[PDB]
Amino acid sequence: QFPQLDPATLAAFSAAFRGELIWPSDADYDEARRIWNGTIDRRPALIARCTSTPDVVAAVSFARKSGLLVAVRGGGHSMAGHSVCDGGIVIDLSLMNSIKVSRRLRRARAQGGCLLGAFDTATQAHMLATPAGVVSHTGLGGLVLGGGFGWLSRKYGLSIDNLTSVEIVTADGGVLTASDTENPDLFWAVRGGGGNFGVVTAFEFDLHRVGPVRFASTYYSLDEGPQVIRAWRDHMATAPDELTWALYLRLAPPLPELPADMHGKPVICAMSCWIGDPHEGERQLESILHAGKPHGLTKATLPYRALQAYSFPGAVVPDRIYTKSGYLNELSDEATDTVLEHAADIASPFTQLELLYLGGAVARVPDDATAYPNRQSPFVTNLAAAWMDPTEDARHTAWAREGYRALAGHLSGGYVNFMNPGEADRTREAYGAAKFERLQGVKAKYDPTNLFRLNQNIPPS
Amino acid sequence: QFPQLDPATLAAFSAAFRGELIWPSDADYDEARRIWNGTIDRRPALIARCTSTPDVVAAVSFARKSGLLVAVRGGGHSMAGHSVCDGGIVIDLSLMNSIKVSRRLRRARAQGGCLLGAFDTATQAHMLATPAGVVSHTGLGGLVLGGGFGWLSRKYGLSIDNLTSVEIVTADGGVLTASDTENPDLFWAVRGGGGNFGVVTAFEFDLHRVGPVRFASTYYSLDEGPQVIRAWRDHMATAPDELTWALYLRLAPPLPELPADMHGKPVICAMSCWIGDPHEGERQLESILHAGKPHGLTKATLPYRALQAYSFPGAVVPDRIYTKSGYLNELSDEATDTVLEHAADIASPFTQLELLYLGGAVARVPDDATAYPNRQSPFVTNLAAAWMDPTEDARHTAWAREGYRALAGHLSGGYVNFMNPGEADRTREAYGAAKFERLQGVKAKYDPTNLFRLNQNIPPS
Numbered sequence: 063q064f065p066q067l068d069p070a071t072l073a074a075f076s077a078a079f080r081g082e083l084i085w086p087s088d089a090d091y092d093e094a095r096r097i098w099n100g101t102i103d104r105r106p107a108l109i110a111r112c113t114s115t116p117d118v119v120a121a122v123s124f125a126r127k128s129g130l131l132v133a134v135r136g137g138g139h140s141m142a143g144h145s146v147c148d149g150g151i152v153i154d155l156s157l158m159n160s161i162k163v164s165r166r167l168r169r170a171r172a173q174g175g176c177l178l179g180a181f182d183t184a185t186q187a188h189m190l191a192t193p194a195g196v197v198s199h200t201g202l203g204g205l206v207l208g209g210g211f212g213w214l215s216r217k218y219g220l221s222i223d224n225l226t227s228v229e230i231v232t233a234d235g236g237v238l239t240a241s242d243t244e245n246p247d248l249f250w251a252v253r254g255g256g257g258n259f260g261v262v263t264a265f266e267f268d269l270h271r272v273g274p275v276r277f278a279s280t281y282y283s284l285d286e287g288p289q290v291i292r293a294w295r296d297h298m299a300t301a302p303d304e305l306t307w308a309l310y311l312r313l314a315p316p317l318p319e320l321p322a323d324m325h326g327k328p329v330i331c332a333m334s335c336w337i338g339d340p341h342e343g344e345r346q347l348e349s350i351l352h353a354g355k356p357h358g359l360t361k362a363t364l365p366y367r368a369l370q371a372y373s374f375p376g377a378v379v380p381d382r383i384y385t386k387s388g389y390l391n392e393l394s395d396e397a398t399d400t401v402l403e404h405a406a407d408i409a410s411p412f413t414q415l416e417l418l419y420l421g422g423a424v425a426r427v428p429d430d431a432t433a434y435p436n437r438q439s440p441f442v443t444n445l446a447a448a449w450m451d452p453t454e455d456a457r458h459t460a461w462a463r464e465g466y467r468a469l470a471g472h473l474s475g476g477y478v479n480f481m482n483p484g485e486a487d488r489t490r491e492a493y494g495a496a497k498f499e500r501l502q503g504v505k506a507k508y509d510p511t512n513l514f515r516l517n518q519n520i521p522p523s
Numbered sequence: 524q525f526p527q528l529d530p531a532t533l534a535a536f537s538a539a540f541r542g543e544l545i546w547p548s549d550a551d552y553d554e555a556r557r558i559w560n561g562t563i564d565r566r567p568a569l570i571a572r573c574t575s576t577p578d579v580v581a582a583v584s585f586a587r588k589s590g591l592l593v594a595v596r597g598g599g600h601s602m603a604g605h606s607v608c609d610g611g612i613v614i615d616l617s618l619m620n621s622i623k624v625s626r627r628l629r630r631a632r633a634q635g636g637c638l639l640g641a642f643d644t645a646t647q648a649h650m651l652a653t654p655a656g657v658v659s660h661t662g663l664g665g666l667v668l669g670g671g672f673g674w675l676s677r678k679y680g681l682s683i684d685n686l687t688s689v690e691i692v693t694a695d696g697g698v699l700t701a702s703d704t705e706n707p708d709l710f711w712a713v714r715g716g717g718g719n720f721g722v723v724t725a726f727e728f729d730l731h732r733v734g735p736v737r738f739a740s741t742y743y744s745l746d747e748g749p750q751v752i753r754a755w756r757d758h759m760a761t762a763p764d765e766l767t768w769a770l771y772l773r774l775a776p777p778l779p780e781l782p783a784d785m786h787g788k789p790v791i792c793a794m795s796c797w798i799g800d801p802h803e804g805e806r807q808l809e810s811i812l813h814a815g816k817p818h819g820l821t822k823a824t825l826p827y828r829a830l831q832a833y834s835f836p837g838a839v840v841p842d843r844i845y846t847k848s849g850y851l852n853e854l855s856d857e858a859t860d861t862v863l864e865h866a867a868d869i870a871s872p873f874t875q876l877e878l879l880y881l882g883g884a885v886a887r888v889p890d891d892a893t894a895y896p897n898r899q900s901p902f903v904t905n906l907a908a909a910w911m912d913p914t915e916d917a918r919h920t921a922w923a924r925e926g927y928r929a930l931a932g933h934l935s936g937g938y939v940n941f942m943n944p945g946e947a948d949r950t951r952e953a954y955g956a957a958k959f960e961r962l963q964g965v966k967a968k969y970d971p972t973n974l975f976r977l978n979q980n981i982p983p984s
């Protein structure tokens with residue numbers, strides 16, 4: 063926490079760095095070191111808030127020279143706690159939030175510290191968008207490096223499927239460009255390979271015109287769980303790419319649109335949207351809403367920016383979280399029953415057992431085209447425990463691990479961006495052997511000393 | 524646009540500036556010089572995209588030494604076209620979008636180029652907010668310096684009512700902090716006096732906790748205008764601060780929630796929200812939704828960030844705009860009829876005649892406490908023509924001027940941030956004589972040469 067540093071290499075860093083430095087003695091240190099996963103309580107020797115690419119070069123080089131463990135932070139959403147370290151340096155990108163958008167080229171260049179909501183605001187000024195995650199204050203950086211999925215993904219692919227280049231700072235302090243035509247081996251690896259290869263300071267995306275979206279959210283009783291889940295699974299198998307429909311098993315929020323009868327009881331929350339014409343969307347959504355008897359139905363026609371901002375309306379931000387996630391190639395009636403049993407046990411009002419259906423454009427990309435594994439598995443399930451009181455940690459964590467073990471014969475792979483702090487050992491199985499090995503080769507080339515290891519780490523071959 | 528610059532002056536600027544320059548021969552120049560108001564077609568000698576406070580110091584000094592007319596650009600929303608100039612320099616802040624939020628202090632520091640949606644994203648990560656306008660890609664900078672109102676204003680005031688300090692670069696290249704206790708004269712003047720005093724590079728705000736908001740929008744036939752507008756004005760006179768209710772008279776958008784037979788015909792779109800508990804909001808919104816026969820009702824409980832992203836769901840971004848706006852102290856039956864007559868003539872599908880009710884917290888601040896005038900007028904009307912085809916300019920512009928002139932006996936003052944490119948002469952009546960004199964005094968002190976004059980301009984002394 064107070065390691066001895068070399069005064070000469072500290073002063074050279076300071077001279078070369080235009081951003082802000084936050085030391086352990088500083089008033090803002092305890093807030094600056096907090097990340098969204100509040101179970102993670104670590105104490106860096108230094109937080110370096112970078113403001114440009116040359117800042118990130120100076121910070122990488124200073125870390126390498128001084129032997130400080132490197133954490134990189136974009137939006138601080140790491141479910142595994144990777145964006146903070148004990149006794150090392152946090153290369154904190156959160157002030158590097160600039161976005162340039164060309165309407166004529168349908169292109170955006172976003173800095174590596176952007177939040178999604180900043181990005182979506184900027185592109186939507188021109189009625190443009192590209193796929194990203196569903197919660198606005200997530201970081202672009204970590205989300206994209208792992209793949210990135212959300213409402214636009216069935217239609218337009220993963221975030222990475224719209225990424226045309228990056229600017230990246232490597233472990234040796236060099237600044238590279240990677241694209242299809244420049245360092246393409248690195249360009250393959252960053253599209254799914256996390257922060258293993260360097261600090262991405264700029265991302266360039268192709269964009270799509272996305273106008274108003276018909277959206278619906280409704281809640282179903284768990285008494286109708288099997289019918290509603292089976293309807294969802296069957297429907298999604300043949301659904302237009304334009305339809306996205308997700309199920310969140312959770313206690314019913316105390317909202318005025320729901321009867322007070324249901325508040326605080328486990329329910330299915332179904333969220334759906336039509337990426338396309340809203341009149342068509344109204345027809346499509348009406349056709350799926352009666353999977354069970356709907357309660358607390360909200361339907362609206364939203365700019366895409368508002369769809370992105372919608373998830374989720376609650377009164378309190380959860381402090382502590384723990385997640386267990388995997389993909390499924392099929393969701394059987396037996397797995398459905400398992401999901402429903404484990405959902406009925408949910409204790410916290412912030413916890414959700416999520417059932418997502420990807421496929422569509424995501425699955426049309428060939429498997430070997432990027433480092434993102436599992437494109438062909440259309441289901442994702444995430445036991446997303448969240449709560450407030452640290453004395454409850456063992457109970458919440460146990461719930462998520464029990465549900466995972468019960469589902470484990472159905473599950474395959476894992477999204478690197480849903481891994482928890484204990485899941486370092488899941489990397490090889492997440493990627494599979496052929497991808498894991500190709501990534502190790504890229505690692506050997508670009509980060510042979512594994513300078514960047516606070517991630518779902520790929521050691522160099 | 525191709526002026527002769529001094530090589531020593533230019534070189535000095537180059538050495539001190541770390542942002543991006545855009546020259547007239549560059550491929551991105553025509554896109555970079557476009558502003559939201561597409562009727563404004565100007566060709567600067569240089570666009571300087573600043574990335575830091577020192578960048579702005581360098582651009583200001585360069586402009587002063589070179590005699591280049593200065594445009595300052597935040598989000599580019601100027602109804603008057605002030606953020607681009609022929610032959611001068613645009614000090615372009617749009618890459619200065621960083622925001623730091625302290626949850627524990629309930630404070631945000633935001634750079635002068637931020638978009639609202641970026642700010643709201645950042646504060647909402649903590650369930651915090653402060654008031655700002657209702658269209659997410661508006662710039663923070665110009666909106667705040669003229670006062671800044673939106674959904675949170677009846678409860679929490681203008682943006683400026685939550686401002687605690689600014690960092691500002693003045694005409695002589697100096698960097699100052701202004702606050703209640705530091706350069707307080709300047710701090711008075713920036714709260715409502717526009718960009719007249721310098722380039723604001725950072726704004727610091729107090730924040731509030733703002734959880735889910737109950738929201739409604741519904742459309743009434745314009746045949747019910749008399750009763751709807753009467754209900755609105757009478758209800759708002761005694762309404763809780765928590766209620767905000769605005770009327771947009773427009774052609775009905777072709778949305779699936781509306782019957783096809785109302786598409787494209789004159790209606791009143793009413794939008795309302797309760798800033799407070801959502802069960803209470805449901806009861807309050809239900810009580811006002813029958814001002815006329817409601818059609819196309821949308822009711823939702825939204826995160827405040829989604830409320831901010833909502834305005835407005837349309838499929839096309841209007842290229843050309845023209846606004847005429849004023850305040851009213853009261854809204855008589857005869858003014859009501861005048862508005863309704865003028866609204867029945869609307870031609871473009873993007874044009875709206877807006878009727879806002881402010882009051883609440885905005886009117887509880889003493890009139891002399893900031894440079895914002897007209898606090899005690901609760902009504903704002905804005906004839907906001909918007910269209911696509913340049914051959915239609917004379918027609919749309921006439922509609923707006925005609926409605927304004929018909930209302931002018933009822934109107935007082937004017938919001939500087941709704942002024943059109945032809946309204947330079949409205950500055951003294953907008954502020955009133957005492958405020959305008961005090962502002963000229965502050966101007967003589969901080970901008971004695973009127974270097975910053977692309978704004979609703981206050982000449983010194």
Ligand SMILES: Cc1cc2nc3c(=O)[nH]c(=O)nc-3n(C[C@H](O)[C@H](O)[C@H](O)COP(=O)(O)OP(=O)(O)OC[C@H]3O[C@@H](n4cnc5c(N)ncnc54)[C@H](O)[C@@H]3O)c2cc1C
Nearest residue numbers: 136137138139140145174195196201203204205211257262
């Ligand atoms: C509430 C919430 C909702 C989410 N929803 C979705 C969703 O809808 N879809 C989805 O796909 N994912 C989603 N996620 C998961 C998310 O993709 C991961 O948590 C992601 O890693 C977050 O990125 P970040 O920059 O915010 O996180 P951080 O904790 O800052 O970083 C995560 C990892 O990326 C690295 N990193 C970050 N920025 C850079 C960079 N610029 N260059 C190099 N390395 C970098 C870090 O070193 C770390 O290894 C969500 C997360 C949260 C917490």
Ligand SMILES: Cc1cc2nc3c(=O)[nH]c(=O)nc-3n(C[C@H](O)[C@H](O)[C@H](O)COP(=O)(O)OP(=O)(O)OC[C@H]3O[C@@H](n4cnc5c(N)ncnc54)[C@H](O)[C@@H]3O)c2cc1C
Nearest residue numbers: 597598599600601606635656657662664665666672718723
């Ligand atoms: C679609 C739309 C919706 C709007 N809705 C609302 C609303 O709900 N509420 C409301 O109050 N207003 C609203 N407005 C009006 C708005 O407040 C003004 O248009 C505002 O001036 C825009 O600021 P900007 O930075 O985007 O514009 P710009 O055109 O970049 O700047 C406008 C003025 O401010 C100066 N300037 C900008 N940034 C700075 C800075 N950092 N320091 C010094 N000078 C600066 C410029 O020199 C210029 O004089 C809206 C505008 C638009 C176009």
Ligand SMILES: O=C(CC(=O)c1ccccc1)CC(=O)C(F)(F)F
Nearest residue numbers: 195196211212213306308416444446
């Ligand atoms: O739902 C998500 C995951 C998701 O990406 C998604 C959700 C709906 C539609 C498309 C994609 C965010 C979330 O709450 C999580 F906890 F899982 F992280």
Ligand SMILES: O=C(CC(=O)c1ccccc1)CC(=O)C(F)(F)F
Nearest residue numbers: 657658672673674767769877905907
């Ligand atoms: O009509 C508005 C709305 C506005 O400021 C407002 C709207 C609702 C509540 C409080 C304030 C401004 C705007 O976005 C426009 F450009 F059209 F003028």
